[PDB]
């Protein structure tokens, strides 16, 4: 994806902070928000598809 | 809330009442007969808007007293949501607790609506420059509305009655500056439960 | 490919059916056409004269058209004509063809694209160009994979004083053309109407309300006629206001008080009768068939467009303008489909055959795609033979072709505001709630139609009505004074006008930050 | 499961009604002609949502009575599944027994729907500030809706009748605080079999 | 087996109709524009399931009549095969004689499919707490299906027509509790020979 | 009789699908499952090669194709799946065509 | 029509006297198959050429740029059965996500790499009872043996997947029992299936194989 963006940006012109949270906490927090239904299966699935397209 | 407020409002006409007809088909059917038809219920009764005469009345009186109220009569003027006029009649995101009925006439078209003739007169020749044929509501006609307040507060009947007294002072409907629309009010108010129908 | 029902031309693109016109020239004959039309994915109304439109609500009534593509002004003129013609059908109480419900359902599926804007529908690229007949006159260019087709439309004339005189034409390759051969004495009118009202008598100018009365009005306005002018026409006043609304789709000279204020719009029938009893110019009637009373006192200079015929005010083209329209296309067409009486088509077809272009009076040309890059170095990733390639999609008129970096290197061998200032102004007018998400969305729908549609839309949203000082924006949220609110409205006008200049990708990137859905 | 409850509901409009157009194409094709279109069919008959009005009415009265009902009308609020509005109108696990039809007008839009001029008037200058146009159902129009309860309990008919009396008191459709949407109801219940279509 | 019963049904749509997109690709393509897509074809016609609706109608009605009909609607329910709905609509061991086609539309999308704005309103505030957008099928939309019964008996046509009248009472697909899916059926039945194609 | 090979590929014609099983008293989805399915308008190509032909073979194959148009091809024929149309291009060839 | 002056119509010609011959034909040629002479022929309003189905599946934005018009696109060429197609990044992202889901589908947990006790007689009795009421079916026993031959951990994982009462629906993945049962007996039979399968998880492979042939002979 870096090289693809490099070439596409390069070619197009030719013509013309994340919070640091520990893994165990992450597990506990998504456990808690899944129990109280804020982070649901549809939410995790959509966030997974948007993570597959990049950060 | 657990309780609601019912304000049964009876209006008697002391001076001829004109409120203008709104429906395009009724206006266009009326054009040959009259030039200014009265707003008419399709079951042959006369309907006068109420919310707007209560809201406008309360906005002028509350703005004259100095309470932090907004103006809903200016062009596309968004209601603020923090004044007692916004709480009573509605904001742009919270509805009004006072559902205000239309002023349904207790009689029909044939009994209280009369078809009449007004003039524009020259100031020098003292003759009719223009004639125009409208129709207003006879005096002594009785109209009935019901204001239902969903979550009532302490100063809810007092503001409605003050708005009603301002309406008797200035008029409701149209041609108020010419003499039309001078009314009387009788209020019968009551506290009902919201669960009064559950049997 | 092209079936000729009538005006009615159907183009079967193999993938979809594109009807162009569905006009009105018994009932069973009209039904034969509607039954033959079949299911059409699109009807493209070239213009609105009820001869290229009219039998379109029927196509909505019998469910034969999915979507109707036109010019915006063609849409509103079609609205006026459909309502008026349904009113007439009830005057002679003729079992009406369609209903008002069919009229209201016709604009349910309508779509508007202005000009020079390519809409891709069902593998066909459709583009609109002007032909100077009426306000939204359009010559339609559909490029399909079996050829490029151009439906001229009623190409206008050099006489037009309201439109351009060179009807615009596709800058690409036109394979088939479907031209139409219906086939300055104005000053004389400006003489004699100046004579007659000097004689103290009135003048009568019977003219059609759609695209004829306004050219008779324009001439009487750019010129000076100290005597008074009136319009006693019922659709005529409304289409004159349609000219004053959709003046942006007119001549570039008239982009910016059209018709001055000379015309007095005769609003009522009482005014019509009292005007016919007056002593003191009255434009009215349809082919001299309100008009009856005017006829009596104009009989008691009656010009036709004192019996008088003036031919200068004509809208249809002349053999020479049609010939010049084909002789101005970049490539000579393969065949001119000379449609729409026999004698005119015969004399024009002789001159065309004398100009060495083919005519049929009612060749497998496939727009292939060329790879032009090596495929030997392919691989199997997940059950597919794939190769990442870096190249360019060249769009030669003969064939689409795909090329590498070698080809690109070898071939190499409106108010204006900055992007940051536009971003800042849209943000500030969005926080004070002049520009809203509904406003940005409506702007994006008008900007998808074209630049001139958005220019009209913001001209409508920023025009301060002279009667009541209402500008039609959304009022600011704050404690601003009157001149500050007017400066904010000017800022919104110039900001959206300056954004009209940009391309659609830049406008989408700017606006999808305020309305995340437009 | 053996019998089923029919409530045939005939509603007569007693003050002008406005349910808004919901279809984007129907609202967009009418915006040059009416600013507020009324919800209509493709057969040009007026459509009113009814299940939500009955559910909201019963939640309001049963919450003001003190019985345990969920407040479903909050944003993304899951119904509890144990209340009687969850029994009558559904939960996320079990559908409603009371399948509530739309309120379909007996007449066509040409007979019962009219255009209208709604105003906003300035309060100091007493003059027309904003003018807009709505479609309104006339008074005297008749709407029909059939409520079918699949597993009828004893109190469901009384709950529907109390909700109908609440809708008569409050209003249905939109613009409810301005006097719009005041209706009258004529319920005609009937306990039919479930197997009555079997010949 | 020499004869076969063809039942041509035409469903006219009388209320709105929501059926749901089953295709994950078509949903994900359409859930950037509308939250409840309509089940459509790739040839842009509306698809409605028909076999499950007729089956469910027959099991509800024949369980109410007291006939021996197994409930296939329960989770992981295995049909017995010794039923009457098991002969028409299949079992674990014998296919159904009544092959029931989809209800495909005569018209297309953008002629019968419209795109609508639905709402959810706070009960104590009367404000739009949530909004979604659905896709609905207009009224007067005609759908055609054919039910071919391979080994016909006398009870098949009557049972299918009965089940159809149950669908005209209840609804065909989607949100049958808020009014959607109320439709009407016209039936044309013929008894063809199985060797009608063999020439 | 050859297989009915599609003209297109899974990413153009095969669409995942959600099927349901609804309880008759609760009207709730008691069960669901996900099955792939071929879209409407997908085109499939087969070739039937008849050796030593008789007169009736074209009529027999065309009648059987009309029966498949009526009743369906593949699975789930009862719930509405498999309804197709057939277009027939027949041609008599000589068995020695390939010999040069 | 291909001509290599014939008075009849000539759609295609294969070639200043050239210009004179070309203008001398009746009608005009649609395309002529001819450098500077080709561009001169272009100047007489006549087209020139100057000498698997390819499908460009792509979005469109066109920059006119030079005399030739272009559209910048680094992408992918996909070779297929009878067609060649051109796709963008999003196609390759989609096939990458599908392939990557197919990858983790594989090598899950520890394939082919804390349990109750009950007698062997008890295990035959419980599997024999749940065979005949359609809970421990033949598909269930098959996938038992498939998850068992990859290890005890996979079998515990599959059993906890089937027995898991989902809090949203209240439905375990067992086959519902056949016969007249109330709810409490149904959960007790499901717990019996839980305990029986988790207790045969502790046994060795030839003491499982010999207990599931007399229910599944095609294990
Ligand atoms: Zn306020
Ligand atoms: Zn024209
Ligand atoms: Zn013409
Ligand atoms: Zn509840
Ligand atoms: Zn059974």
Short mmCIF file of C-alpha atoms in Angstrom, two decimals, chain E residues 55-144:
data_model
loop_
_atom_site.label_atom_id
_atom_site.label_comp_id
_atom_site.label_asym_id
_atom_site.label_seq_id
_atom_site.Cartn_x
_atom_site.Cartn_y
_atom_site.Cartn_z
CA UNK E 55 -46.40 -22.67 4.24
CA UNK E 56 -46.61 -20.59 7.44
CA UNK E 57 -50.18 -19.57 6.59
CA UNK E 58 -51.18 -23.21 6.14
CA UNK E 59 -49.50 -24.41 9.36
CA UNK E 60 -51.08 -21.61 11.44
CA UNK E 61 -54.54 -22.21 9.96
CA UNK E 62 -54.40 -26.02 10.04
CA UNK E 63 -53.03 -26.03 13.59
CA UNK E 64 -55.96 -23.77 14.48
CA UNK E 65 -58.37 -26.17 12.76
CA UNK E 66 -56.95 -29.04 14.82
CA UNK E 67 -55.49 -30.98 11.90
CA UNK E 68 -52.26 -32.92 12.33
CA UNK E 69 -49.77 -30.32 11.07
CA UNK E 70 -46.23 -30.13 12.42
CA UNK E 71 -44.71 -26.77 13.28
CA UNK E 72 -41.73 -26.39 10.96
CA UNK E 73 -41.20 -22.80 12.10
CA UNK E 74 -39.53 -23.83 15.36
CA UNK E 75 -35.74 -23.82 15.42
CA UNK E 76 -34.20 -26.88 13.74
CA UNK E 77 -37.69 -28.44 13.37
CA UNK E 78 -37.74 -31.66 11.27
CA UNK E 79 -40.96 -32.13 9.17
CA UNK E 80 -42.67 -35.45 9.78
CA UNK E 81 -43.83 -36.15 6.22
CA UNK E 82 -47.20 -37.57 7.31
CA UNK E 83 -48.84 -34.13 7.21
CA UNK E 84 -50.80 -32.21 4.60
CA UNK E 85 -48.46 -29.21 4.44
CA UNK E 86 -45.60 -31.73 4.26
CA UNK E 87 -47.02 -33.06 0.99
CA UNK E 88 -47.42 -29.57 -0.51
CA UNK E 89 -44.24 -27.95 0.77
CA UNK E 90 -41.89 -30.83 1.47
CA UNK E 91 -40.37 -32.84 4.28
CA UNK E 92 -37.16 -34.56 5.30
CA UNK E 93 -37.53 -37.40 2.83
CA UNK E 94 -40.04 -36.18 0.24
CA UNK E 95 -39.91 -33.01 -1.82
CA UNK E 96 -42.95 -30.79 -2.04
CA UNK E 97 -45.23 -31.27 -5.01
CA UNK E 98 -46.02 -27.53 -5.00
CA UNK E 99 -42.99 -25.83 -6.52
CA UNK E 100 -43.65 -22.19 -5.65
CA UNK E 101 -41.95 -19.46 -7.65
CA UNK E 102 -40.75 -16.12 -6.34
CA UNK E 103 -43.02 -13.11 -6.61
CA UNK E 104 -41.07 -11.18 -9.23
CA UNK E 105 -42.35 -7.75 -10.22
CA UNK E 106 -43.77 -6.86 -13.60
CA UNK E 107 -42.13 -3.43 -13.43
CA UNK E 108 -38.60 -2.57 -12.32
CA UNK E 109 -36.77 -0.64 -9.64
CA UNK E 110 -37.18 3.19 -10.11
CA UNK E 111 -40.77 2.51 -11.16
CA UNK E 112 -42.09 0.65 -8.12
CA UNK E 113 -39.20 1.02 -5.62
CA UNK E 114 -39.15 4.26 -3.65
CA UNK E 115 -36.71 5.40 -0.95
CA UNK E 116 -38.21 6.56 2.32
CA UNK E 117 -37.43 8.27 5.62
CA UNK E 118 -38.63 6.51 8.79
CA UNK E 119 -38.53 7.96 12.31
CA UNK E 120 -38.47 7.27 16.05
CA UNK E 121 -39.94 9.89 18.38
CA UNK E 122 -39.27 10.58 22.07
CA UNK E 123 -42.43 10.10 24.11
CA UNK E 124 -41.84 12.87 26.67
CA UNK E 125 -40.25 15.31 24.18
CA UNK E 126 -42.08 14.54 20.87
CA UNK E 127 -38.84 14.99 18.93
CA UNK E 128 -37.14 12.78 16.35
CA UNK E 129 -34.84 10.69 18.53
CA UNK E 130 -33.73 8.46 15.67
CA UNK E 131 -34.01 8.40 11.90
CA UNK E 132 -33.43 5.63 9.40
CA UNK E 133 -34.07 5.23 5.72
CA UNK E 134 -35.81 2.25 4.15
CA UNK E 135 -36.75 1.04 0.70
CA UNK E 136 -40.38 0.28 0.00
CA UNK E 137 -42.52 -1.06 -2.83
CA UNK E 138 -45.34 1.22 -3.97
CA UNK E 139 -49.05 0.45 -4.13
CA UNK E 140 -50.58 -0.94 -7.28
CA UNK E 141 -47.35 -2.78 -8.08
CA UNK E 142 -48.13 -6.10 -9.75
CA UNK E 143 -46.14 -9.25 -8.99
CA UNK E 144 -46.55 -12.57 -10.79
#
